[PDB]
Amino acid sequence: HSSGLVPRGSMESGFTSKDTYLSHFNPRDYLEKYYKFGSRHSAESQILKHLLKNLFKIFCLDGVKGDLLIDIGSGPTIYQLLSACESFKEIVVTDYSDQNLQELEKWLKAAPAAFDWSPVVTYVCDLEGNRVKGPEKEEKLRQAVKQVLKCDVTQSQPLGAVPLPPADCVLSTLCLDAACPDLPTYCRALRNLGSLLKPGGFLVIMDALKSSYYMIGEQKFSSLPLGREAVEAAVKEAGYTIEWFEVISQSYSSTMANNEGLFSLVARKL
Ligand SMILES: CC(=O)N(CC#Cc1cccc(C(N)=O)c1)C[C@H]1C[C@@H](n2ccc3c(Cl)ncnc32)[C@H](O)[C@@H]1O
Fold this sequence. Notes:
Blueprint: H1 20-23, H2 27-34, H3 43-61, E1 66-71, H4 79-82, E2 88-95, H5 98-108, H6 118-127, H7 134-144, E3 145-150, E4 167-173, H8 176-179, H9 183-194, E5 197-208, E6 213-216, E7 219-222, H10 228-237, E8 240-248, E9 262-269
Parallel strand pairs: 1-2, 1-4, 2-3, 4-5
Antiparallel strand pairs: 5-9, 6-7, 8-9
Helix pairs in contact: 6-7, 9-10
The chain binds ligand 5R4.
GO cellular component, one term: cytosol
Protein name: NNMT protein
Family: Belongs to the class I-like SAM-binding methyltransferase superfamily. NNMT/PNMT/TEMT family.
């Protein structure tokens, strides 16, 4: 323990170790901190609002759609799946943190103590032209998530021995910056993720730019600080062609992250 000097579980290697996410990452503190849609004019809400807007553009407006979408790094969050749910018959959510899976499974069964995503669901519904309502939307997403699996991006087999068909798309929101301690592992993880993709399948990555850390209240966690070029290069190296690539200037509040914006991209496997 370093008390804010360095991120938790990082004094030895410099990067927050994987095991720190099984112990100190409290998903309910994370949800309450980063995904409260109460004040819609907060720097966090603006990030989430742009994530959804981009997810809406990829999944409802563009052509990213198919049988299987593997979500890598789901965290305790389901916002990243609201738009994809309209485009994929089956979604698979994955994450390293058991507590994250724990909170995910509470929402998948609509338990009362589960985090309330209803204000977030409504905004997406608006983006989708209000063809549905809040409750109908959640049920559709809940019906499409067929598996809740362990995940490890540092393994050649990221979803373990679990046999899945090749997915049409792979989606990772705010995962690789926290998971990959360096660029070679970042590049390698992107290569392992491709082992789950149909040839010519889509890869969708939205993460922070130039972020050495991010805050969960007083708990600091390591993030890999990446420029657009470092991202673009690691992706192309992993066996991908970048179809489009966006970079935004909006950043998290000074109390929450030192990132210099966010990036979003769609890439296909060669
Ligand atoms: C998906 C999310 O919401 N996560 C919480 C945040 C955030 C956040 C928010 C704002 C800015 C930034 C930033 N500055 O970048 C990060 C991260 C994820 C990472 C994930 N993790 C950790 C190791 C690991 C392995 Cl080895 N393999 C697969 N997943 C793994 C672990 O489970 C957890 O859920």
